[PDB]
Symmetry: C3
Subunit: 445 residues, 3 copies
């Protein structure tokens, strides 16, 4: 069929104490409002209408999304008024679902039930019964029949016992909806969206209701404490989905996914790992404690040792990296390569079974197979930046500075503490050798 959504996101997030529009605040590293858009997209939402008051410019900025239909608003004067501003935008043949930019966790199932329990020429309304309903809108039924919503405000002591409350999420045909809207008053001073419930039982239509499966689906964010609770809920969910799909998390409450994780079989992730962007892990990969991976491919059987950071990096199968290793964009390890502690790799490839074990920096480097990069080796590659190249079976002594552009051919050997400015030939040894000078019985300060 046909269906569009409207996302309300116009209020003042005063209690966020922020210079950033509330709805742009991230949940698992992405704007609250994008979770809602994402969901709308998953419904088949043909169009998405976003209603905003202040924060306009950097809202549409921080949200590229050229596919969206933006809707300005005088200055927050009515949640119903807001719904009026987008009213002329609803095609009469399409359903119109209403969501809030600060309720990021609303599941598709719960909406794709709402859209099924909508009575022809009527409203599908999402509701939840509360433990303590001590301040929300009551759902007022007569014979279990929805007739209208009561604000906690004007609620008799008898009504205040009504557990079931309004999530503020609901459906209706675009035609019928255009109707019910601009037939409402302002006599708080504002216009309540609540009213279109009674103003629907008015002209004899039936308003049905489904419930969300989790309370968190309809949790609204007014402040950061609330947002952090939703972050935890969201992370527990992701973690449990990975556990059930075969990934071992040594402590799923100390795990964070902010993006996507594609994975193979029998992966172990230890405590306090964070996964950002899109990470692909092969079979039998092990990630130690404290590692941060962002936009990485890690090949079958690789081991990432504790406290290793990787971003836009690639490891083939059987590699080992860490502890205390830092791989930056362009870092590439060929099959069975090893990078050790206090080693940084930038736009560099370390070939098959090559080793860089300690205290080294490698950038803008093409290194071959079976190469030994001694402790303390530095590509001195900054003066743009220049390329260092090393063939197979090369031995690079400790504390060597490779001054690029420089090429060291296969089988070459480089003595410790050597500066290399000129190219090195196959199987040639090079030793930057001076003469250590001796004073006898020297009195140390």
């Amino acid at each position: 069929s046909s269906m569009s959504v409207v996302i309300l996101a116009a209020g003042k997030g005063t209690r966020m104490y922020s210079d950033l529009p509330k709805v742009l605040h991230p949940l698992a590293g992405k704007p609250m409002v994008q979770h809602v858009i994402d969901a709308a997209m998953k419904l088949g939402a043909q169009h998405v209408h976003l209603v905003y008051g202040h924060g306009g410019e950097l809202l549409k900025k921080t949200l590229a999304d050229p596919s969206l239909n933006w809707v300005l608003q005088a200055e927050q004067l009515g949640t119903g008024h807001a719904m009026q501003q987008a009213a002329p935008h609803f095609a009469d043949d399409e359903d119109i679902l209403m969501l809030y930019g600060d309720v990021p966790l609303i599941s598709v199932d719960t909406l794709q039930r709402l859209l099924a329990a909508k009575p022809e020429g009527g409203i599908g309304l999402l509701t939840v019964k509360l433990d303590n309903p001590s301040g929300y809108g009551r759902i007022v039924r007569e014979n279990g029949d929805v007739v209208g919503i009561v604000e906690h405000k004007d609620a008799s002591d008898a009504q205040r016992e009504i557990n079931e409350i309004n999530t503020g999420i609901l459906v209706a045909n675009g035609r019928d909806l255009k109707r019910w809207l601009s037939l409402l008053d302002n006599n708080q001073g504002e216009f309540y969206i609540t009213d279109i419930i009674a103003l629907a039982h008015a002209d004899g239509k039936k308003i049905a209701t489904v419930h969300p499966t989790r309370l968190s689906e309809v949790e609204g964010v007014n402040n950061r404490l609330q947002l952090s609770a939703l972050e935890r809920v969201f992370q527990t969910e992701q973690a449990e989905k990975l556990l059930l799909a075969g990934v071992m998390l040594l402590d799923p409450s100390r795990f964070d996914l902010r993006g996507e994780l594609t994975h193979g079989r029998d992966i172990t992730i230890d405590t306090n790992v964070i996964i950002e962007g899109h990470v692909i892990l092969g079979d039998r990969v092990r990630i130690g404690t404290g590692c941060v991976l962002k936009n990485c491919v890690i090949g079958d059987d690789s081991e990432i040792s504790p406290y290793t950071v990787l971003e836009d990096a690639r490891l083939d199968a059987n590699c080992t990296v860490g502890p205390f290793a830092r791989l930056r964009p362009g870092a590439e390890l060929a099959e069975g390569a090893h990078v050790g502690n206090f080693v940084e790799i930038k736009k560099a490839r370390l070939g098959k079974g090559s080793k860089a074990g300690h205290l080294s920096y490698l950038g803008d480097a093409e290194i071959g197979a079976g190469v030994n990069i001694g402790a303390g080796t530095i590509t001195c590659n900054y003066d743009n930046k220049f390329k260092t190249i090393i063939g197979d079976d090369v031995f690079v002594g400790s504390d060597t500075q490779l001054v690029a552009p420089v090429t060291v051919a296969n089988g070459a050997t480089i003595g410790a503490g050597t500066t290399v400015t000129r190219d090195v030939a196959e199987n040639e040894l090079v030793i930057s050798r001076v003469k250590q000078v001796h004073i006898q019985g020297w009195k140390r300060p």
Copy 2:
């Protein structure tokens, strides 16, 4: 009005298995007993009387606090006996409140209710009703009127149903208190402080009661498991206060504050951050996972990357530091400065927009603006310690050792692998240049 406090802290913390007096054990990095003192100070407590048995010397030692009035005690023989030892110390015109050194979480509100519900010539008594009261002192009321306390010990099956129990915290006028005290017996062998309740209804005075708002306010520490529970409670509280005041914590259950955090607006703190001493963070600062900050000022818009440790360090605005960076006391970054991975800074300043990106140690250094500190640069500054100075626009090649005292003037350039013992002049290049020596077809061992 006038008011003093007494802190009881004399028992044997046997179940702590410690050589340190129980009350000195830290909660959020400060002695249990200091939390209690702190609170007393916040009441306006004119004097604080501290009653102790063993542990005396290093108690008054580990607690400088020359403002305190110490009170010795034979050898724990009566909680009431203890209260006798400080009795001659209470002015008749002042209220005397009683607290315990091992109940660190007692809030001011709860005490500044206790002090309001005190009946003239009578006791204000703190109480709590328990889920399971299966071992404490019962509050025995007649017509809801407090008449005396029953030890779980001698408690009829009927009494054992009394949910409400004694926290052991209470008030009373100093005069009246001196009275009720030394009129009690020793016929456990000890003197119970419990009794002064009935010995107050005795001479026809009214004993009122307020409750603490949280159970944790009256939780006593007898062991470390108990202390750890209170640590978590205390940390959750702090975390929620920062969230509500506008700081984003990516996981408030993996956050620890052991001191004070002054903050501006829109700060993000990722998982597993610890804050010690006094930390000042400006607007829009980001602290990555695993960072430890102790006594630091971080300027607006700075980014601290994961696994970075800072102590007594200062960053101006727009600085970036980490990952894997170590800043020690005296470390200072000017506006937009960058410190990278595996870099340590001690008593050194890195000027405007200067960079130290990798594998470097800088101590006792004054470095100017626009300076590039190549990978592997070391201030060789130990032989006391001597000063290294570098002007603006200097380029320092990788793996340079700067042997202090040495001065490198503006615009100078230093080739890679250079040892610098002598001063360098404006725009002068210096290259510690030897000659790499070549053996052909060398057989590597």
Copy 3:
């Protein structure tokens, strides 16, 4: 008396999505099934019979344990059938207890109650009453008398109210057990082990029942989410045992023990520490945040600073190591030694009060007392591997490469940036000194 156990571990752990047999999956770093074996050993279990279907070879492989009696099985066709396969293996004079390889948390107390509540010529049966019993085997009693087990399957609406359920764990004499077994049918198609309950009330014997003290004792693992819950339970338990025995954990929910921890008095362990293998900590040791210790001895009063990794390493008293330090097998610190940030130690000893503060790698080294290892010092010890030796009171300048085999005698001093290939004599100074070369007004690229 006499007693043997049987561990059932033959099903398909399909929902583990693993190439590793379910029961081999680790809990606190050791195979689920080893926890069960361990427990059996603690009972005095004279023999342990392990029944398995597929996964056979690498089961008996990954479990050396030459003490075990393995029992093959056609192909999972009956949990009772399985129990038949080991039936001919039970001595008539011994008790036979039945356990499952995927229920790792079953305590000895609960089994050493089961073995006491066994009625002569009868069954001791472990049971638990459930909050929601909505899919398990009901315990069917008549006058509170166990008569037989009902599968949730064939269970009247009336029976489905029976809270109490079958853990599947039970006892019986080996003789009697051999009996009750091979008198059962296959008319699911399989043989139910359930039946021997009614087939015991059949020949007029009494089947008693004890309960486990914790629900987690009888939790079965079918998937990784379940296993992770048990991991957390197991870790909370260990943590609380260490807290009660006197170790301070700054956050027991961010602590992991995968092995054994021997400890002395007044130890503090900060957040996110992992303990693997066997770790011995002396009195008054402090372990900072993020440290990983595996098979280490740490002497009285040592301080391990944050983010330090140690494996098969030894520290005497008063040592300090970290932050950001990496100690590998063979790493040894003598009394009061210090290792700083970005320092790696392999098969090396750093003598009394010696210091290696920054950016160094030391392997295969014997270093004496009072030695100063400057920043950036590297043992260039790889060409097998060769030994570097340094006596007392030696000063090693920064960025020195020690090319082993080399010996530096007592009181010697080594200038910064020195390569050392030859031995150094007592109190001799050595400076690898070249000449820095100067270009005036050099235009930096």
